[PDB]
Amino acid sequence: MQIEVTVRNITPIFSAAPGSNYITIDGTINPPPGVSRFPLVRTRMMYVAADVGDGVIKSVPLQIVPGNTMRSLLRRTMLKHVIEPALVEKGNKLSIGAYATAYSGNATGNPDGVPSSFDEIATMRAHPFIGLFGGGPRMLEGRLMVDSLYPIHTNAERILGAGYENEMMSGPITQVVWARRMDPILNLGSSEDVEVINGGAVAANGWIQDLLANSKAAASKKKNGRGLKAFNAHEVVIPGLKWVWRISLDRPTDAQVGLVLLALNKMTNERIAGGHSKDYGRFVIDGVSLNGEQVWSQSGITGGEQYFDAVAEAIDGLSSKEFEQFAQS
Amino acid sequence: MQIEVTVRNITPIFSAAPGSNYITIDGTINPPPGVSRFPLVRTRMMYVAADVGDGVIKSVPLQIVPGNTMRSLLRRTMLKHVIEPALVEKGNKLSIGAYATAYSGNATGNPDGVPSSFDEIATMRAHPFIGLFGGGPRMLEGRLMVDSLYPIHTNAERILGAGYENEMMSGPITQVVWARRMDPILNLGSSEDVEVINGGAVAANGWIQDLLANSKAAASKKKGRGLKAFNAHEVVIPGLKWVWRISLDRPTDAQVGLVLLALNKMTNERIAGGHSKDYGRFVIDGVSLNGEQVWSQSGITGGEQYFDAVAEAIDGLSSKEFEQFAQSAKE
Amino acid sequence: PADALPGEGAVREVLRPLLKQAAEKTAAGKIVFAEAATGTGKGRMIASLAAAAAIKGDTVVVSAPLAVTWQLVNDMKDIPEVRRVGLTLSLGRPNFISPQRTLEWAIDNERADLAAWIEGGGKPLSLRSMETSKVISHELCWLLEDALLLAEDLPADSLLLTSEDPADCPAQQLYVAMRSNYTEAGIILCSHFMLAAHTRMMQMRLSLPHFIDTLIVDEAHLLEQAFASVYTHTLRLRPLMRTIEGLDALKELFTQMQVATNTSLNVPLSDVPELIPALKDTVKTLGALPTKGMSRDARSVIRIATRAANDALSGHSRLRIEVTPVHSYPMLLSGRSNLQRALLGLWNATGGATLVSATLFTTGDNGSLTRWKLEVPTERAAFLPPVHPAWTTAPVLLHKEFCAHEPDDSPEWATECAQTIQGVASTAQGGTLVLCTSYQNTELLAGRLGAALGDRLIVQSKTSSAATCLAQFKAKHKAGIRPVWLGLGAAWTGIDLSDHSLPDNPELDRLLSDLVITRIPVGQNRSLTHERRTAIGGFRIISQEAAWHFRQGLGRLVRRPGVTHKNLWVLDARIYGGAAWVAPFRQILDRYKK
DNA sequence: ATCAAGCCTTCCTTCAGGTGTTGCTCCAGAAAGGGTG
DNA sequence: CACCCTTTCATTATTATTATTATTATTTTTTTTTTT
C-alpha cells in the first residue's frame, strides 16, 4: 500500500536544525571568528548521494522536513479531524496513558514493558489508528510508514528516480529570513502612549535607564540579564516548491487506508515543520497517487470509495475502550 | 477563518533587507569593485519557485513584506485601536513587563523553560488577544498565523492558486530611489540666514573649515563623519496588488472578530518602513472570510457574529489576564 | 447501476463516475469543468445530465455547435424523462431561408426542385429536419440545409434571412413564433452564439430564459470564441460601396485607413489621423439616406455598417483592420479584448453549469487557463478529473523519423520536409494528412510535392476551404487511391476523419492512416482577447494554447475505439532538440510508445 | 511642371570615502518526599 | 490508595563550523462562424 502525496508549499518551510549556526550581515554562513557574526538556526538539511552532473554520486545538501515530523502531523490530523469529532460525538473520554498513546505514542501510561497477548496484538493492529501508530507500553508495530517530505530537486533526483524529472527544481533551495524583536519601550513616545503603563512615565524611564545600564555593562564586558532587542536569522526553504511524500502501509486493513485518506482530505488546515507565527508550512496538495494511480481531486479524494466506507464503519465503531486497553493493561 | 486580504499600496513599500549592498550611479545592483559605489538598502526579497517559460521551474526573487513584520503590524493595530483604548476607558492598567509582553511577545529575554498550567494555556488561548499572540515568558502557541505580504505577481503564481490570474503583475517590480542628505550650512547664503546660529558667521565658517579639513582627510585616506551622505534604497513600486493570508487554528469568534476589527483599523496604518518618506500607506480592496468576500468601501459589512463576540470580549477585557500572562515563573 | 440517472444506461462505462461527479457538483451550483475524449460518447452524457437536471424542475439549456445539435437531440429523443418534460430547439435568423429571394433565384437559374419546394410552404425534406420537427413539435420550414440539399451552389448569404425582411413572409413569421420555444419545453438546445447573443441581449436590458437553472455546454473550448464573435462588429467597405452605387467621405475614410506587418492591432484610440471625423461623417451620411426606395436587402447592409460604425463610436472597444483572402479589400473591425462583464453576466444567470469539451485542461485538471478564458467565477469553478482512455493512444503508431531542418519558412526546410512527407506517403497504405501551420509553409510544401505526388496531392489555401478538401479527401479514399492532404486552419481542430461508410466495423476504418505534424502550432490564435491574455500572462499563455492546438491536431487520429495501425509522425526538430520551452509537447508525446 | 534639396562643433563637470543596534534566549531529569483528596 | 508535586547529583572544560558562494533577456502571423 503505497501513497505518493505531492504537495506545494504556499508559504516557506522552516524545520529548525540543531546547532549554533552563525551568519554575517551578508549571506556568509558560519564565518571565521573575529568578525561580527549573528545567531542562526537553519532548516533541517542532510547530505544525500546524488548522481548529478556525472556518473559518480556526491554528498549534496538537501533541505527537507524529517519523517518524524510528518508522521506526527499525519497522526495529529487524524486525531483532530477524525478521532476528535467521531469520539466526541459518542461521548468517550481518554485517560492519561490513552491520550499519551494516541497523541504521543509514549509509554507514560505505565512505564514498564507491557506483555501483550497475540489476540490483543492482532486486533489492535487490525484496529485502524492503533494499527497505524502502535507504540507506548505495548510497543506495538506501526502499520503506517511515513517517508520524509522530499522536494522535487536535483539533490533528491535519485530518491525520485523515475517520473520526476519534469517540474524539478535546481540550484539553491534555502534563503535566510531575518527577524528582529525590538524593545517596544523604545517605540513609545506620546503622553497618550504611556498612560496605560502602571507607573507611567517614571516606569518607562526606569526601563530606559535599566536598558542603558545593561548596554554599558555589556560594552564593558566585551572589552546576565538581557533586554528585549534581538536580531537573528533563520534559513527557510523557499515557497512554491513541490514536495513528495511516501506513505507505505505494511499489509493494511481497509479502514487504515480510509483513515489515511481522510487525513489527506482534511490535512489542508494544518501545517508543516512549525514556524507557526511566521505562518510557515502553509501548503496545498497537488496530487495523491494510491499505488501509482492518481486519486486526488481539488475537493478531496475522488475514488477509493471502499476505503471511505471502511473508515466510515470504523469511526462509527470507534470507541475509547480500545485506546484504554492499548494503554493500561 | 482563513482570512485573505488584498491591500493596494498607494505609496512605495520599503521593508529593508539586511546586508551590505551597493549600487553604481547608473543603477546596477552590487557592482564589481573598483567603480564608484553607493550603499543600497534593498527591499525585502524572498526567493520563490515559479513558472518561467513552461516547466523550467526556478527560484526568482519576489519582493515581499515579512510575515513577522505584518504580524507585528496586525498586533499593533489591534493593540493601538482596540485593546488599549478598551483598557484605559476603564481603570485597568498594565505593568511595563506586561506591556512588553503584549507588544514584543515577552517581557524580557532569557525565557523560563518551566511550562505553564493547562487551565492557564486554555484560558490564554480563549483570550481575544493572548490566544492570537501567544508570547509570554512560558512560550505559548498563539493561534494567529500571519502570512508574508505577496504582490499579486506572475512569480507568485504557485503561491496563489486561482482567482488571481487577472489583476496580476509581471516583470521587474521595483525602483531604486536615491537620497542626497545635503549639508545644511552649505546652503547658508547671507547674514539674515545666519542670525539664529550662535556666533553667526564665525561658527558657520568654522564648521566650513572643519568640512574642508575632513575633505583633505578623505583625500589622504583615498590617496568624524560629515553630513553629506548620498545613497540609494530599493522600494517596491506603488499601486501593486498584494495578498495577505491570516490563519486561525480553531479560533474563538471573538478572536477572529479582533482580527476583523483590527482590519477595520488597517486603513491609515503603515506596512513596512520609510516613515519619513510616507512609504507603506495602503488601501484594502478586499477581505475574504473562508473565501467569502466581506469587504465594502465603508468597512466590513459582514462577519457580524465575530463582531459581537469581540465586542462582548472587549468589555470583558481586563488587565488580570495580561498580568498573569506576563508573570515569570522564575521571577 | 443502482439509483440510476435517466439515460445513464446508454452511457459508456468508463465515464459513469464522471457523470456522477458532474451531476453532483452541478446540482450543488458549481460550474463543472468536465473533460472527456472524443470517442467516449459525450453526447449520451449531456443527454443524461440534462435529463437528470430536467426532472428536478430546472429550466435546462444545452449550448452546442449546430453540427453537434442533431446528434444531441438524437441522444435525448427517446429517454422518457425528457419525453415528459419536453425538448425544444432555439434558432436565430441565419437558420432560415428567404422564400421570395430564393424563388427569384430558382426561376433565374432554372432549378425545378427548389422552386417546387418553396411553392407550397417550404416543407421540411431532409430526414434531420422532419425528426427534429417531430421532437420540437414545430414544423421546421424554410431551413438552409433543405435548400442546400436541392441546390448546393446557392448564394447563401444573399438568400440568408435578414432582420429587414418583411413581416408577412412565412420564414420571419416562423422564426418570430419559434422565439417563444423556451416556454413550452424544459430543455432548450441552442448554439454557443445564440447563448452569447442572449447574454448581450440581457446586458442591453425572450430568446432564452432570463435565469438558466442548469446549463450544459458541449464543445466548451469554442464558447469563449463565440463571445469574441458577437461582441465584434465589422465594417465591410466594398459591399457598402457597391450598395450605395445601386459617399466621398467613406472614400476618404478608406484613404485614411491606408496610412495606419501589424496594421492597427489592439489599439482603441491611440491613432486618430482622421479616423473619428471620417467615422462621424460615415455615420451621418449612412444614417440619413432615405429608407423609402431602399431595397429590402440593402438596408441590412446599411444597418450592419452603421452598427459597426457606432460600435467604433463609443471608444469602449478596440479597432483592427483586416483584408479578405480573395483580394486586398479594406476591413474595419471593432472587437473587444476584455469579456469579463459579458461572461460574468452569463454566469450570474446560471445556477449550475457543466464545462464539457475534449480540450479543457492544460496539465492534469488545471483548468485555470480555460476558467480565465470564459471568466468563470473561481468560487463557482470546479475542474473535474478528466478521462483519457488507453484506447485513444493504443492504436497510434509513433515513428522516430523526422525532418532535421526546423521550419523557418525556408526553401531548404520545405525540400527536406517534402522528402519526409514523400517517405510517409510511400509507406502509407491509406489516407495521409500532414498538418502545416502557415499558408507560406503550405504553399512551399505544395510547390515541392505537387509534381512529386501527381494527382494524390490535395492543397488547402485561400481558394480551397477545409470542407471542400474534406469531401475531396473522402472522394479519393472512395476511389481507392491514397490521398495526401496539406491541411491547416480547421484541419487542425474540428474535422471528423472517421469513415461513416464503416459504422459497425472500426477495425477496417482506413480514412486516416498517417497523421503528420510538420511544426508545433505556436501562435495559431490571434484574437483580441487571446492577445490581451498573452500580454497579461506572457509566454505561458502562448505555450499553453500551443499545447492545446497540438493536442487538438493529435486528436484527428483516433475518433472511436477499435481502430488499428494508426501512424503518427512529428517532424518539428524542436521535438528532438534539448530546448526547454518545447517541454510540454514531450509529455503528450510521452503517452505513446515505440 | 524643377532646382537647391544644410552646413560646422558642440559629444560635460564637480559631489556622493554612509554610519548606528542588531553580534540570542529556554528546555529537552528522573528520583524520592509530603500533603492532599 | 493511586496520583501530583518539589528539589538533589556532576564538575567536563574547549568549541571545529558547508568556504559553500549569492538577483535575467523566448513566438510570431490564422480566416473562422451561422447572431442581432
DSSP labels for B279-313? TT-EEEEEEEETTEE---SSS----HHHHHHHHHH
Whether C360 contacts C33, CB under 8 Å: yes
Q: What count of other Cβ atoms lies within 10 Å of the Cβ of residue C119? A: 11
Which of the residues B157, B165, B166 would you substitute to probe the C interface, choosing the one with the greatest number of C C-beta atoms within 10 Å? B165
> B171: nearest CA in chain C?
C538
Q: What is the separation, in whole angstroms, between the first and last Cα of chain B?
A: 37
Instruction: Give me the amino acid identity at B145.
Output: M
- DSSP-H helix ranges across A79-199: 84-90, 96-99, 118-126, 128-132, 191-194
What Rg, from alpha-carbon coordinates, does chain A have? 25
Residue C308: in which H helix or E strand, if any?
A: helix C298-314
Instruction: Write out which nucleotides of chain D lie closer than 7 A to a protein Cβ.
Output: 15-19, 21-28, 31
Which of the residues C362, C380, C533, C536 would you substitute to probe the B interface, choosing the one with the greatest number of B C-beta atoms within 10 Å? C536
Distance, CA of B172 to CA of B174 (rounded, Å): 6
Spatial CB neighbours of C421, under 8 Å, sequence gap ≥ 6: C434, C445, C449, C484, C516, C518
Whether C319 contacts C334, CB under 8 Å: yes
Q: What count of other Cβ atoms lies within 10 Å of the Cβ of residue A272? A: 24
Distance, CA of A246 to CA of A314 (rounded, Å): 24
Please tell me whether any atom of strand E lies within 7 Å of the Cβ of B52.
Answer: yes
For residues A21-52, one letter each, b for 16 or more C-beta atoms within 10 angstroms of the residue's C-beta and e for the rest, the string is: bbbbeeeebeeeeeeebbebebbbbeebebeb
Place of cell 520563490: B48
Whether A101 contacts A119, CB under 8 Å: no
**Grid coordinates given for B95:** 505593568
Whether C343 contacts C537, CB under 8 Å: no
Q: C211 at the B interface (CB within 8 A)?
A: no
> Which 256-285 positions of B have CB less than 7 A from strand D?
none
Q: What count of other Cβ atoms lies within 10 Å of the Cβ of residue C124? A: 21
Residue A5: in which H helix or E strand, if any?
A: strand A2-9
Interchain contact, B18 vs A27, CB within 8 Å:
no
**Grid coordinates given for A311:** 473508515
Distance of CA C219 to the CA centre of its chain: 9
Instruction: Write out which nucleotides of chain E lie closer than 7 A to a protein Cβ.
Output: 3-4, 16-36
Closest CA to B258 of B77, B7, B78: B78
DSSP labels for C119-183? TTT----SHHHHHHHHHHTS---SBHHHHHHH-TT--HHHHB--TTS-TTSHHHHHHHHHTTGGG
Q: Point out which residues pair with A3 in neighbouring strands.
A: A247, A290
Closest-lying nucleotide for B139 based on CA to C1': D26
**3-state helix, strand and coil shares in percent for chain A, rounded to the nearest 5:** 35, 25, 40
Distance, CA of B325 to CA of B104 (rounded, Å): 13
CATH topology for C396-590 is: Rossmann fold (3.40.50)
Helix (H, G, I), strand (E, B) or coil at A126: helix
DSSP labels for A165-198? STT-B-S--EEEEEEEE--TTSS--SHHHHTTBS
**Method of elucidation:** cryo-EM
Closest-lying nucleotide for C488 based on CA to C1': E30
**Grid coordinates given for C295:** 431595397
> C25: nearest CA in chain A?
A299
Phi-psi region of A135 (alpha: psi -120 to 50; beta: other; left: phi over 0): left
Distance, CA of A313 to CA of B53 (rounded, Å): 48
Q: What is the resolution of this structure in A?
A: 3.7
Please tell me whether any atom of strand E lies within 7 Å of the Cβ of A32.
Answer: yes
Helix (H, G, I), strand (E, B) or coil at C187: strand
> Interior CA angle at B28 toward B22 and B29, to 5°?
40
Please tell me whether any atom of strand E lies within 7 Å of the Cβ of C203.
Answer: no
- DSSP-H helix ranges across C213-274: 223-230, 237-245, 248-259
C-alpha distances out from residue C378 to B34, B165, C32, C273, C370, Å:
54, 10, 11, 42, 11
DSSP labels for A225-241? ---S-EEEEEEEEPTT-
Spatial CB neighbours of C360, under 8 Å, sequence gap ≥ 6: C33, C34, C35, C220, C221, C367, C370, C386
Q: What is the separation, in whole angstroms, between the first and last Cα of chain C?
A: 39
- φ, ψ (nearest 5 deg) of residue A233: -135, 155
Interatomic distance B102 CA / D37 C1' (Å): 38
Instruction: Give me the amino acid identity at B168.
Output: M
Distance, CA of B12 to CA of C552 (rounded, Å): 46
DSSP C491: G
**Grid coordinates given for B133:** 499572540
Q: What count of other Cβ atoms lies within 10 Å of the Cβ of residue A303? A: 17
User: Dihedral of CA C18/C23/C29/C31: which sign?
Assistant: positive
**Grid coordinates given for C365:** 485538471
Phi-psi region of A236 (alpha: psi -120 to 50; beta: other; left: phi over 0): beta
Helix (H, G, I), strand (E, B) or coil at A86: helix
> Interior CA angle at C309 toward C306 and C311, to 5°?
110
Interatomic distance B100 CA / E14 C1' (Å): 37
Whether A97 contacts A328, CB under 8 Å: yes
Q: What is the separation, in whole angstroms, between the first and last Cα of chain A?
A: 31
Q: Point out which residues pair with C97 in neighbouring strands.
A: C160
Distance, CA of C536 to CA of C539 (rounded, Å): 9
Closest-lying nucleotide for C535 based on CA to C1': E27
Whether B228 contacts B183, CB under 8 Å: yes
Please tell me whether any atom of strand E lies within 7 Å of the Cβ of C439.
Answer: yes
> B86: nearest CA in chain A?
A196
Q: Point out which residues pair with C189 in neighbouring strands.
A: C62, C89
Q: What count of other Cβ atoms lies within 10 Å of the Cβ of residue C408? A: 9
CA–CA min distance B54, chain C (Å): 6
Whether B25 contacts B218, CB under 8 Å: no
C-alpha distances out from residue B118 to B122, B124, C551, Å:
6, 10, 60
Closest CA to B283 of B267, B265, B295: B267
> Which 554-573 positions of C have CB less than 7 A from strand E?
none
DSSP labels for C398-450? E-----SS--SS-HHHHHHHHHHHHHHHHH-SS-EEEE-SSHHHHHHHHHHHH
Distance, CA of A245 to CA of A159 (rounded, Å): 11
A195, A197, A203, A209 alpha-carbon torsion, rounded to 10°:
-100
Whether C369 contacts C533, CB under 8 Å: no
Whether C339 contacts C14, CB under 8 Å: no
Please tell me whether any atom of strand D lies within 7 Å of the Cβ of B58.
Answer: no
Half-sphere exposure in the Cβ direction for C184 (13 Å, CA): 12
Spatial CB neighbours of C171, under 8 Å, sequence gap ≥ 6: C96, C97, C98, C99, C122, C141, C142, C161, C165
Interchain contact, B53 vs C543, CB within 8 Å:
yes
Half-sphere exposure in the Cβ direction for C99 (13 Å, CA): 19
Interatomic distance C285 CA / D17 C1' (Å): 75
Closest-lying nucleotide for A41 based on CA to C1': D24
DSSP B65: B
Whether C47 contacts C55, CB under 8 Å: no
Place of cell 483572402: C325
User: Interhelix angle for C223-230 vs C340-348, to 10°?
Assistant: 120
In chain A, residues preceding a discontinuity (C to N beyond 2.5 A) are 223
- Closest protein residue to E3 (Cα–C1'): A96
Please tell me whether any atom of strand D lies within 7 Å of the Cβ of B229.
Answer: yes
A247, A253, A255, A257 alpha-carbon torsion, rounded to 10°:
20
> Which 311-330 positions of B have CB less than 7 A from strand D?
none
Instruction: Give me the amino acid identity at B331.
Output: E
Residues of B in contact with C371 (CB under 8 A): 162, 165
> Which 330-389 positions of C have CB less than 7 A from strand E?
none
Instruction: Give me the amino acid identity at B242.
Output: W
Instruction: Give me the amino acid identity at B135.
Output: G
Which of the residues A8, A167, A279, A282 would you substitute to probe the B interface, choosing the one with the greatest number of B C-beta atoms within 10 Å? A279
